[PDB]
Amino acid sequence: YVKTWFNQPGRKLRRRQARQTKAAKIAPRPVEAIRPAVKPPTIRYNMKVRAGRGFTLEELKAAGVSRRVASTIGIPVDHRRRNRSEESLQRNVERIKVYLAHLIVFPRKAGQPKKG
Amino acid sequence: EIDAGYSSDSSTEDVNLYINYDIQSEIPDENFDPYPDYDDFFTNTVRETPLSSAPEPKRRFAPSKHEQKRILQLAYAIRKGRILTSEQRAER
Amino acid sequence: LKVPPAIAQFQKTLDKNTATQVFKLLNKYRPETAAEKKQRLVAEAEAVANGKVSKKPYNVKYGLNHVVALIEAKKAKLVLIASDVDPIELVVFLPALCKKMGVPYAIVKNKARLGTVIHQKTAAVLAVTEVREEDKNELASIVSAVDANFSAKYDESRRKWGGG
Amino acid sequence: APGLVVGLNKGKTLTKRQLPERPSRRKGHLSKRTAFVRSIVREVAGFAPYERRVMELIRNSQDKRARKLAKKRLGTLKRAKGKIEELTSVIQSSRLAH
Amino acid sequence: LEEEAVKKAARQSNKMLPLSAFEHAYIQRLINKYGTEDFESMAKDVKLNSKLFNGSKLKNLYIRMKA
Amino acid sequence: GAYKYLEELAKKKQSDVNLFLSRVRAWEYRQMNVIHRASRPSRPDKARRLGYKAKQGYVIYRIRVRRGRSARCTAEERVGRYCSNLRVLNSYWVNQDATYKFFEVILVDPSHKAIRRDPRINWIVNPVHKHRESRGLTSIGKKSRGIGKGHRFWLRHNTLSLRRYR
Amino acid sequence: ENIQKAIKEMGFETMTEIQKRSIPPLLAGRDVLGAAKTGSGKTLAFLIPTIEMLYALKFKPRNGTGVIIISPTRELALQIFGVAKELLKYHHQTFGIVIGGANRRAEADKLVKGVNLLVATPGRLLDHLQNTKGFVFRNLRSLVIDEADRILEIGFEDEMRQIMKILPSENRQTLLFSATQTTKVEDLARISEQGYVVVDSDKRFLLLFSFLKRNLKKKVIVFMSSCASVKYMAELLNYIDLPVLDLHGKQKQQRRTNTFFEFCNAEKGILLCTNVAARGLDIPAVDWIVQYDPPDDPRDYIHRVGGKSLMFLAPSELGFLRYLKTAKVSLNEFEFPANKVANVQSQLEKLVSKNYYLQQSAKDGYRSYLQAYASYSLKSIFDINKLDLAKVAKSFGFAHPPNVNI
RNA sequence: AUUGGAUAUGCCAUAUAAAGCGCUUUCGAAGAGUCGAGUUGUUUGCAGCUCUAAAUGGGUGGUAUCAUCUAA
RNA sequence: UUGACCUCAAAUCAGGUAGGACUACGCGCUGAACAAUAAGCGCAGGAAAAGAAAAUAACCAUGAUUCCCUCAGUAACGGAGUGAAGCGGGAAAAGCUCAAAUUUGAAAUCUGGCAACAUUUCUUUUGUUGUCCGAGUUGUAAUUUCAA
């Protein structure tokens, strides 16, 4: 049993086309969602800042985005993670606010019945 | 202290021919009552208060809402001419 | 085998006379039929469509979860339990819960009669919570009869292991 | 500008935060209705043959006998201790009445 | 993209609901009896306020009646 | 609700009421066939919490398997073979005696329109759910093959991955 | 200033002697040990300086609790909470009240949200400051204790020193008010003619309704232990064609003063108010004064009373008659016949059950009455266990006692 | 010639309706022949067999009380 | 005598569905010699399985699953040999549905027949509306899933 990698260039191209196929479907919006900034959970890496999964409910509440609309504008929600320190809260609230400063949200049509 | 005693009901027990040096039956238990009378140790007294402390919703003091949803749906069908009215059914 | 007291209590049911009086009050409080409800709703629909305040309906209460809820809230005045519920565990706790809440209760014969009152094929339990002011005396008389014929009667065999 | 600097270091200045309790951690809390339902069922349903043995042992003193029996059937001693306290309360409630 | 978004939001900006025939009559009967500024007493009425709307809903019915 | 009483009563598995009923019902169930249709679940609380709804397209079947592989898993596969037009949803223990263990299986008809129009059970209609009990995709099947999360619960290691540039 | 507008909205222009000598020093962040009599206008004395303090520091909900106020009993705490609502009508600083006998599970969620101005009692406050996770109080900068002599009279000895060991002491401004100077007050400060009716509980309201009908053409005032009881009693009486004014109002101080002024000016009419609300108000020449519920502070009540005085006493509370003997106060017993008592209990129960707001008020009044009863200082005289809950609900218009968490 | 998602524009829209976010003197249900204990095999898992639970409980970790999770 | 309900039935009653084949890649139950392998048996799809923590960790904490790289031929087991995993870096990212609380001022729910009206990858496919019957109170909808 030997696993060959002759399809390594083919997989590189296939993933690139998936990125372009996705961008064709969603024309003006980014192909990835915004990820939070977290700290790896060990003494070896806790000084590094890496990308998280989603923003905590306390982060979203502070930034002014409700958890029901956060997913609609591309902000992932992590119900599992929590803010044990005020630094993680401030690092990711600013990340959300900067995200909302650069965001153009196109309006949607709404059904308005003629009567009351 | 526990005195390191030994109860008379422990699982372990004491005692070619094994005589060199020194240091089954179907026995019942007792006449036991297998069908004891019902013992009301909890409902012998009446609980005077309702079990639930949840507040009473306003839906129980107002006309039914899902009936109103049906009434508006039936009225719409009458306006759209989908449901024959009682007078129309009677005259037909 | 020997029937436990919780299951043996369902062999002693309400007698002929008191059960007849029970269903006579119940038949005055039957729920609105699917047909009758439809006529009343379209009548309001015609009023709404042309141009347009009622009273709270009075009827018997049915459904196991609903009735057990009413007993726990002490809203029920009389609970009638079918004596032949096929899995008996659905009602085996009901007489004791009615005892804990001090709700008058009886075990009437068969579930077909209970279901007929509510326009269904089968009702495991019925409960009466509210009656009109003219039926207060009739309900009070039945509660006394149920107590005298079902609670005052027996009350000693329901603690005994029946069967065998 | 939106973008994450994925390198190291953000600042060693740290200050703890106070978090509330998640609703999952409330599991195991006893409800008023649930305790009522369990008491009703415990009375309506009888007692297991081993529970009747433990109850009759407790009545005639013999506490070590009851604890040993409960541990043998249930398993760990924690389960056995809980059953003795439960069955003792059943006896006392019954003895107050019958 | 930004100019198109703002011009569509301005066009689809009518977020004020006018009262219907039933809503108008419902709030009118309550106002013509319990004044205009007291909404808590309006909601606590059982005969005129049969639907048992709270003070907030009656306030919204008033506000929508004005516009 | 009355299902809190039924769930609490089912924990007293050999109280006076439960032992008498289990003895009585075991005698009856042995009179009928090995696999026989149940008009209604004997444990309406347990069937209800395992996904069963009292509506058309939901079928309850009882089965006895000899004691002395998992018994619940054997009940599911035999019942699923018995009525091969249905999808096995779940199963639960109802009774046992010295010789037999009795189980009830909840089956769902994927061709009935009350099932195909319910989005909450629509998933079972798809052909990827054909004979879930035969591939270990039921609750007991998942438990039997050690499927779970944690440290409590080979081909990629026996291979030799050889990259292009290595 | 928003504080000034709220004060004007509350209906207050002039200041009292206690306020004159306390507000200026309080604005300078000076710890003060005050000694003012009951109902001397203290409510504006200790509340408005710390409200300006909260505005000055620009406190936000995320900062947690910055002001803590300790009250002896629930009813006094609720009135202080009501006053704080009036004062903070034009502010964005959050406020809340936690008290014994209330929903602790709900208060924990309220504290986690962030409540700046907190009104509490020693029993509940210590519980929340120990076991409530996420309750932020490290920013506390103003603590106030009211009725310290009363607080130590209740039985909060072991709690007052225990709670102070947890709360921060540095930078914190401290206030202590005590009408009477015992030895315990300084110890905590250094570290920081009658008439009675033996009426059964279930017939209490029916006797009161019959009595008020008989004396419709006179001036009657009734004291009841809880404000929630006042609101329900007034609302119920107005629903049976018995127009009776109430001092509860809509928890607006201006309306309460207006209602009291109208009652005093009117030659006839009946007004319902609590003992605490009536404490500190000049009682006019009223023909009848009625004590429907036992007073929270009998020591204050006997001094306050000293045309006709009536007291509704349950048979289980006849021990209070022995207490009145030890206080050297003359009294007489009034007897009533059951035939003159109106038998509208069945009608009363039907009316309450049919209406939503009447039933909602009755449940709140019943819960508040029981909680006030359970917190009485005279445990031996007014024992909640000796009370029959079935009879109490009957007087409130219930067929069965509502489920209240004690 | 088939069909995707949108856009724009008409006609209808059963809204007496349904939601998100504030607040709480009110409440807050959580899966049993299962967990687990003992004993036999297969490989901690799985299974058979005997017994058989709990409600701030239960699982899993760091303590050698704390942390984390919320199974059937 | 009749009726309601339950149970057992029957029917060339109406409408559906299962089997068998292919199995490179899924997933199961098994199982030798020498490998948790071959073979045997069962069950699928365009992927399958897994999956929104009864998961890690001991940190400034992480955050469903899957896959790749690394960890690492390391710890551990048992000297040989067997041989992981947390972290870390990537690919892709999406979350949710019930059981358990009374709609109780109204079973608000659903299949089928019949009759019209549409619609079609399509006279071959899909529905909608009305009416009747049945299902269902031993519980079908709305509401809730602990993140609440």
Residues in chain D: 98
User: Per the structure block, which two tokens stand in for F57?
Assistant: 């397209």
Q: Measured between alpha carbons, how far is residue A29 from residues A16, A105, A109, G117 in Å? A: 17, 10, 19, 46
- CB-count burial class (<10 Å; 0-12, 13-18, 19+) for G32: middle
E 30-59 residues, CB < 7 A, strand H: 51
**CA gap C6, C3 in Å, rounded:** 8
| Sheet of F35-38, strand order | F35-38, F58-66, F100-108, F87-96
The angle, 0 to 180 degrees and rounded to 10, between the axes of the packed helices G183-191 and G157-166 is: 10
DSSP G231-269: HHHHHHHHTTT---EES-TTS-HHHHHHHHHHHHHSSSE
Nucleotides of H under 7 A from a protein CB: 7-8, 13-18, 20-34, 36-37, 44-58, 60-61, 69-70, 72
Strand ranges (E), chain A: 2-4, 37-38, 50-51
**Residue F102 falls within a domain, yes or no?**
yes
Please say whether the beta carbons of G121 and G73 come within 8 A. Answer: yes
Backbone φ and ψ for D3, nearest 5 degrees, come out as: 160, 140
Residue F151 lies in a domain: yes
Per the listing, tokens 């006042």 go with G230
Q: Is residue F115 part of a domain?
A: yes
Domain hosting F123: range is 2-158
CATH number, domain containing residue F23: 3.40.1120.10
Handedness of CA D77, D79, D85, D89 (dihedral sign): negative
Q: Does D96 touch chain A (CB under 8 A)?
A: no
Name the structure determination technique: cryo-EM
Q: Which two tokens stand for residue A104?
A: 């153009």
Q: Which of G138, G158, G351 is nearest to G241 (CA)?
A: G351
In degrees rounded to 5, what are phi and psi of residue A30? -60, 150
Cα G37 to Cα G279: distance, rounded to the nearest angstrom:
10
CA-to-C1' span, D20 to I148 (A): 13
**Cα angle, residue G220 at apex, residues G214 and G222 outer, rounded to 5°:** 110
Cα–Cα distance for residue pair G208/G230, rounded to 1 Å? 14
Q: Determine the Cα–Cα distance for residues G393 and G201; give it in Å rounded to an integer.
A: 9
Strand I nucleotides with an atom less than 7 Å from a protein beta carbon: 4-8, 15-19, 26-30, 36-37, 42-65, 67-69, 73, 83-85, 87-108, 110-112, 129-141, 146-148
Residue type, C44: E
- And the tokens for G92? 């964005």
| Amino acid (1-letter code) at residue E33 | K
Q: How far apart are CA F25 and CA F21, in angstroms?
A: 6
> How far apart, in Å, do the first and last CA atoms of chain F sit?
67
Sequence-distant (6+) residues with CB within 8 A of C19 are C13, C106, C108, C109
> Per the domain annotation, does F8 fall within a domain?
yes
Helical segments of chain C, H only: 5-8, 16-26, 34-50, 64-72, 94-100, 112-117, 136-146
Backbone torsions φ then ψ of G348, nearest 5 degrees: -65, -45
Q: Is residue F166 part of a domain?
A: no
**DSSP 8-state symbol, A42:** S
The residue among G263, G254, G261 whose CA lies nearest residue G234 is G263
Nearest-angstrom CA–CA distance, C149 and C14:
7
Integer angstrom CA distances of residue F132 from D95, F55, F140, G250: 54, 22, 11, 64
> Is F135 within a domain?
yes
CA B65 to each of CA B69, C37, C72, G69: distance values in angstroms, whole numbers, following the listed order: 6, 15, 26, 45
CB atoms within 10 A of CB F4: 20
A2 CB less than 7 Å from any atom of strand I:
no
D9: left (phi over 0), alpha (psi -120 to 50) or beta: left
**Does residue F163 belong to any structural domain of this protein?**
no
Contact C4, F16 (CB under 8 A): yes
- Give the integer Cα–Cα distance in Å for A55 and A49: 15
Best CA proximity match to E20, nearest among E28, E12, E11, E32 = E28
Cβ contacts of G371 on chain B, cutoff 8 Å:
none
Can you tell me whether residue G334 is helix, strand or coil?
Answer: strand
Is A5 in contact with F160 (Cβ distance < 8 A)? no
DSSP symbols for E10-62: HHT---PPPP-HHHHHHHHHHHHHH-SS--HHHHH-SSS-TT---HHHHHHHH
Q: Do F16 and C69 touch (CB under 8 A)?
A: no
Q: Which residues contact G186 (CB under 8 A, 6 or more apart)?
A: none
Q: Report helix, strand and coil shares of chain C as percent, to nearest 5.
A: 50, 10, 40
Q: Give the count of alpha carbons within 13 A of D51, CB side only.
A: 19
Q: Which residue carries 């003219």 as its tokens?
A: C134
- Number of domains comprising chain F: 1
Rounded to whole angstroms, the Cα distance separating F11 from E67 reads 62
- Per CA to C1' distance, which residue is closest to I62? A41
Q: What is the CA radius of gyration of chain A?
A: 20
**Beta carbons within 8 Å of G118's beta carbon, 6+ residues apart:** G65, G67, G68, G69, G95, G96, G97, G98, G125
Quote the Cα angle for A83-A86-A92, to 5°.
65
CB contact under 8 A, C93 and D41: yes
Report the phi/psi class of residue B4: left, alpha or beta, with left for phi > 0 and alpha for psi in -120 to 50: left
Bridge partners for F161 per DSSP? A3
CB G70 within 8 A of CB G121: yes
Tokens read off for B7: 């109860």
From residues 39-78 of D, which are strand H contacts by CB within 7 A? 48-51, 72-76, 78
Whether F164 maps to a domain, the answer reads: no
> In sequence order, which ranges of G21-70 are alpha helices (DSSP H)?
23-27, 43-57
Annotated binding residues of G for ATP, written as ranges, equal: 36-43
For testing contact with chain F, the best of D36, D40, D43, D44 (most F CBs within 10 A): D44
Number of Cβ within 10 Å of residue C114's Cβ equals 24
User: Which residues lie below 8 Å from residue G44, measured CB to CB, with a gap of 6+?
Assistant: G7, G12, G15, G16, G19, G83
